[PDB]
Amino acid sequence: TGAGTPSQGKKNTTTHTKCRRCGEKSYHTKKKVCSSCGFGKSAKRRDYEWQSKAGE
Amino acid sequence: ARSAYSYIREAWKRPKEGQIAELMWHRMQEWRNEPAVVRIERPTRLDRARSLGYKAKQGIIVVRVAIRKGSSRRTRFNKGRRSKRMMVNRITRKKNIQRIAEERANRKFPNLRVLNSYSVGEDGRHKWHEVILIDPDHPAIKSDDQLSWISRTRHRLRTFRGLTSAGRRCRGLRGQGKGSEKVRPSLRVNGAKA
Amino acid sequence: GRRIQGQRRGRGTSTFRAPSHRYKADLEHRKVEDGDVIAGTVVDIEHDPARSAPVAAVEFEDGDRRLILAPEGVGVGDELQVGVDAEIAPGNTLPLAEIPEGVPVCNVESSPGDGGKFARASGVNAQLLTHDRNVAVVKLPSGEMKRLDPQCRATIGVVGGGGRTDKPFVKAGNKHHKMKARGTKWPNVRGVAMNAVDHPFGGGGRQHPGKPKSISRNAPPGRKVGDIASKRTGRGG
């Protein structure tokens, strides 16, 4: 079975959804964790220094 | 004449001799069965405590913390590393056990601030330290001309920023002359070379 | 290279775990205050999914209902006893001291009260040889002479289900069904049939182990494969 187009047909599973805390469609309803703000994993807000250039 | 306190001090100079030696052998048995952080009504080394700032007063807390002995509990590298950085066994943390003890106690009492701490011995694998914490919100402390300084907002979370007793010594701030070039005023300001 | 299969095992992932939730009971000798008075009646005989051997359901006098590691010859209605003064019949459990030497025994405790550790698989049994006030010498199924505290409890008789190993599996499918009831990864790909990256015997233009198969006791995991600290190999001599 082709890994491309033919394998795209079984994709009717809902995972990432609108997050209660940040509003982004990143709340993974299976994991109950937002990949954008960290809701469900961290009280503190998700954020990293690599999200911007080193000297900025 | 000699203070009664001077006798507690004298005994602790050699914790493996005389009566104290036997107390320890007794005590540790119960300590080893106790938790990581245990609040105690009275300081095991009263002279030590009073000397550090302890007072039989409201808002003053003492707690004994257990910490494992030894070097860094380190995970081996999972990617490329030059030989110099492949190390595991001999690496040791830059923060001493007493300091770890102070932080663990402090986290257990989020509202209190660490005043100071001292050692109360060790066995083959634990090290025990008693930490003196203070309630900066309790009047009685707010009204004490000797401890009120710790109530200032600038002192929130002293231990975590190395403003503690053991914190400052462990940071190399002991000496005011030779040897403290990369230490004072801070390790970070000196590029982290001490 | 990559971690070898024996290393994937230790992580305890689904593939390597036993289907515990599907198991029936943790066969252990009952605890008796003392006196031995404790007796019960066999209410049924069931299949043990964790041992491919039968097991017995027992109702004890004090209301307790527990499955038991069943020796051969136990049936519904029988009355089993557990205690120092228990009669000496198959199916009963008592300390090696109260057991007459020369009697076959099973589900022997390693240390008094641990509930039984030795001789529990299909049709096996231990052999109580010597007594004493200090040591009870038992011969385990492997043939070893084990010195045990005479206070260690045991069950009279040989474990039920003897002869299971006598029948060949005949086909892959039958192994399959059994393997599905154990904490094991099956089937087994030979190391020499793998790539160098996957196993110390992997690689090569043809199939053969790279070095000799006998590996030192001190070899680290990832390398300890083949014949571990073999004192000898082959059949000759």
Partner: protein
Amino acid sequence: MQMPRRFNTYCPHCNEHQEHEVEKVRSGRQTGMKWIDRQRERNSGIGNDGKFSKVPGGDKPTKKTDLKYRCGECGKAHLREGWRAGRLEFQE
């Protein structure tokens, strides 16, 4: 080759010819307290030790003469250029 144990020759100390005695330089024992010794201890740590992880060079097919010429009257010795010699045996 052969070489006389004693012979007349210039003594740079006496500043005049005198009988000298020839001897092969016996190696002196190390004290282990030189700077290089302290640097080895100091600088060796986890991983490769740089220069201190190196091992003993090798050998030239023939070594040069390594001798001491000792004045027979003032007792002071001096050193000279050596020359390649597969073997050096003294006469008497």
